[model samples]
Target chain A: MVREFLAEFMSTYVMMVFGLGSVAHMVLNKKYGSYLGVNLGFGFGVTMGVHVAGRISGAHMNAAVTFANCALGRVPWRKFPVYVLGQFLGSFLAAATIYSLFYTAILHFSGGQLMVTGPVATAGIFATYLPDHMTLWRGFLNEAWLTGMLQLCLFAITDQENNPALPGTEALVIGILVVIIGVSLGMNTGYAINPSRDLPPRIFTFIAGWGKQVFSNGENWWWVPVVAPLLGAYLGGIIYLVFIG
Target chain B: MVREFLAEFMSTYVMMVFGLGSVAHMVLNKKYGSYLGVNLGFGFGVTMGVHVAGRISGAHMNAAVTFANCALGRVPWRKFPVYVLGQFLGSFLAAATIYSLFYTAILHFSGGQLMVTGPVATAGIFATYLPDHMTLWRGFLNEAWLTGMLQLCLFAITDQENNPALPGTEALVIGILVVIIGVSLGMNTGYAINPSRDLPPRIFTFIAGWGKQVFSNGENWWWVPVVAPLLGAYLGGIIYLVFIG
Candidate 1:
């Protein structure tokens, strides 16, 4: 149990470090990269994390995915809390590391004024924010749709009897799968298809002086990311099992 | 020979359809996706193409890769023309399809005047364009470096003995590898690391009424993409054989 928990923690940490690090690089400095660079960072980060911890904890890295696995009987219900806790820890630690690494740059970019909602606010670098045009219900629907698509594809890629991805390549495939999702459906809610990916980072921002706005500013948007993905992932699992798996 | 040729043609076509299609979507319409969407489109396009034709002709959809394979004796020299021809044909066809699909949108976006150079000119959508600040030699060097790195990673990911990617997943890994290269080094010269990926689309743009400037513009930049990628791919293959293979 300890080993599995550690694996989840370490794997999630790797994912966020690369994912958030890319966003920081892009948002802080134009020369470092662009929007494309952020997408690549998130995609490759997941790939590397899976490579690192795939053998031990299956590299769920997402609470919604863990929930899906447990509900589907692929994982034991008893181990669920441990996995989610490890994921949260890993993500929070990664957020801290990224904050420290880019401390000076953030201050420089934000001009020493950090607000939860602003053009220069650095909070979105660590956590996601909904666009002004997007309502909470629409955002919730988008998250669910995207996560459902993701789980469906995940099931297809890993389905050995059908067109299973070649052994070592599953991580890469899943990563590319993520890149596709981000491109096709990412703009609305910043594509927080993973609860672990969004919640912990948002929490860190709250503690790091972003204040209640991180949680309350976007129409109380924090819970949508957490709730939508779980339902979406469950639906996705069922869709795959019924139609393709 | 025909079988191999057709495989190359179809595979390159698939690659460009997704790749060029993404660019058209981005440049012609903001609602489809952003710059990151374009990157993801190209990356996943390659992944899908490889899966479609990996078993046939080794899916060397790029002329530069085919050239490297022949020069290295991995592919017979006599079949070189077939591979290049297939790749060029496939890329050209894909470009045509993209042009036709986006014809109305292009007309609306560019006001029916397609200049080789301009913020609204659509030529860069089909072919690559060097930024005004970038000299020809620098662009050439950049392409070479990017291609060399690509070949090196390709060899590593596909290598069975040294940490080969799992079977069935080589395509995905290669695709992610591309996403990284594009993110890290793509801004300069559009990272045209494949001759097949660049030349055919450029030629199509020239014939489609973008004018000779498509070839002669930017200090006659057309040849650099062709020659640099070949040299870089050859060097990359040698580097892999000597250091990592």
Candidate 2:
């Protein structure tokens, strides 16, 4: 149990650091900030994390995925708390690390002040923000749609009888799958496809001086990113089992 | 022989369409145009190509890869022409398809006046061009270095005794590998790692009246993108056979 906790924690940490590190780079730096770096960062970060934890905790790395697995009977309900907690704590610290690593640059970029919403807003670096045009309902459905697609393809990727990704290459393939999802469909929001990826870092921003705006702003949009993916993943599993299995 | 020819041809054709299609989207379209689309374009393009030809002609969509296999004696020498010719022809036609499909947008973007090297340079949409800063020697070495790294990792990916990518997932893994290369190291020259990807498009640009600059310009660069990767692929195979085998 301890090993599983650590594995999940470490893997989620690896992914968050890689992902948020790129967002920081995109925000604070420009020379290395090619547009695709965020996608590649998140994609390959997941790859590296999966490689690290695949054997132990099965690399859940996402609370919604863990929830779906438990609901699907693929994992025990008892393991759910450990998995979600590991991912939460891991992403929490990752937000801290990114904050510290880019503190000076962030200081310059935001002129020594971190506004959660403005021309010099830097809070998006630590967590996601909905654009002004986004409605809460649309945001909810988009996330659900994105997570639905993720679990659907993910189910296909792992379904051995239906052309599985093979043992050694799942990490890399999953990363590419992520890249495609980001590149093709991530326009609506930042595509926070995982609760672990979204919520805790969001809370960290709330704690680490971004203020309640991280949670309270965006038309009360904070909760949907977590809730939508969980529902979407469950539906994906149910659909795949019914239609695909 | 005909089956192999068609396989190589269609695979190369698939890659060029996906890759170049995204480039077109980046150029003429702004709404769906994305920063990472080109990287994802070429990366997943190769993935689709490999899946189409993995069993038929080993998916040697690049003439450079075919040449390396022949030099390593993995492929017979007689098949060299077939492979190269297939790739060349496939990409040649794919270039035409991209051109026709985007003819109106190209007309508006360039005002129907095609210039190979200028502010409205659309020739690069079909082929590669060296920036004014890139010396010929650096361009040569960069292509060689990229191809060397490619073949080296590829050898590892295919080596059964050395953590191979497994059979079913090689195409997707290979695509992700291409994405990483494009994302990390494609700063210099658009990373035309495949001769099949680079050459025929150049010729198409020339024949389509972008002028002889398609081949004549770039400080004599048109040839190296072909020759350098061939040499690099061979040396990579040699290094892997000696040190890794």
Candidate 3:
């Protein structure tokens, strides 16, 4: 059991490292447009992670997913804390590694004043380009709505008891959903729908405190991602029951 | 038969309205950085439509797909013309809706000059970004290659006889392929690979005579999208037979 938990930890860590790392590299290069390329990288990483870990851990790397599963009684409630802990640790380690590789580049480019930040938020953390007119709440709302839809799709397609035919196709379906969100909703706030995806990395940003800002303007916007998707998961479970099941 | 055709027609119409409507919105909303967002809306509509209609119509919303089905003998040649006609009519009506919404926005915002021209060739279609720099042939070639790849994936995954276990997953796969093309190749003339998506909308542009300068460069750009996709569809049909089937 411990080994399985550790495997989940390691798998998620690699997912964030490669996924977020690609985002950092593309934003730094500026060859492709900023958030658009980062969104693709993020989606590809999650897809590949599921492909790699679906057989082993069921790849519920995001806490919101685990929460949804627990809420619907698919997974044991007792196992929830460990899984959530593993996910956060994995994301933290991944972000730390990504930060280490690009620290020099970030400093070099931003005049030694750059610190890591979430890909969709203020650029002090990473080199993201937020639209000038969009408000912080709008960004939060976009993330919540898009994340909720994504989580709904994930739960509907991957719930074993309900969606028994979902495993082999999990990575492809989830990855494609991520791409859809990125393409449609990413323009606003870079679309950080995962709590683990957004928060741990934001912690790094606070620690680094680059750009002389302690937190983003969207600070505490975290609750939207966490709560909205949990609600959405319940709704999705019911929706799937009414429609396809 | 008429009811089934009506479903296909209405579904394709909505597909184009929402799908191509998104394109028109993106073209006009470039100020908000909508290039990827709108393209995503287009592709996501295709996927969601399939989720809703796949069980009912088998949801071959595009002519290229229907044509490919006929080639593989999954669909009879006798039914091909009706499907094509349905697709074209749906696309035309959808393009008209998009035009109405677009020009209204233009007039409200920019006081109703001829709004849809081209950033590539004319001042701009929606908002007039820049004159197009790619040769007509280049744009056509890009469209052809993209649509061909798109169809190949569609044929491989959607063939009920071949991949019966996962019959419903093809729409998601085809949608993701479009997202990939949009992310990777959209910057070069915005990646309109569907003949119906391109040709009907282009015809609307010509008849509206927004600029009366669409074909002024003495370039037979129309042939590229038409010829390239057909060629690619032929190759894709053969590939599907040899590889996936």
Highest DockQ: give the candidate number: 3
What TM-score would you give candidate 3 relative to the actual structure?
Answer: 0.60
TM-score for each predicted model, relative to the true structure: 0.59, 0.58, 0.60
Residue A217 displacement in candidate 1 (angstroms): 1.8
Q: Looking at candidate 3, what is the lDDT of residue B56?
A: 45
Candidate 3 residue-wise lDDT at B153: 73
Encode model 1's per-residue lDDT on A117-198: one tens digit a residue: 7779788898888766557887887788668767766665666664567887789887876766666456557788999999
Q: How would you encode candidate 1's per-residue C-alpha lDDT over B1-245 as one tens digit per residue?
A: 88778767766876776677667757766644576677777877777667545666777888888888898888899999999998899899989866754565567779889888887889988899899899999999999988889888887887788998877767777888887787789998898888988999999998899999998889899999999999999999999999875
Q: Sort the predicted structures by DockQ, highest score first.
A: 3, 1, 2
What fnat does each of the candidate structures reach? 0.20, 0.14, 0.12
Error of 1 at A117 (Å): 1.4
Better of 1 and 3 by lDDT: 1
Could you tell me the interface RMSD of model 3?
A: 6.3
Identify the superior model by DockQ, candidate 1 or candidate 2.
1
Clash pairs (backbone) in predicted model 1: A166-B167, A166-B168, A168-B166
Error of 1 at A26 (Å): 1.8
lDDT per residue for candidate 2 within A125-213, as digits (tens), equals 87777766556777777678668656765665666755466678788877876766565445456779899999998898888888888
Please tell me which model should have the higher TM-score, number 1 or number 2: 1
Q: Any idea what lDDT model 1 has?
A: 0.82
Which regions in candidate 2 have their CA more than 4 angstroms from the true location? Answer: B1-32, B35-166, B173-245
lDDT per residue (tens digit) for residues B1-245 in model 3: 56446545655664565565445445445533366666676776577545534554566776666777777787788877777776677677766655543444444444455534433222233111212588766665666566667777776566667663354465666666776877887666566565566566666666765554443432545545545666666667777678776
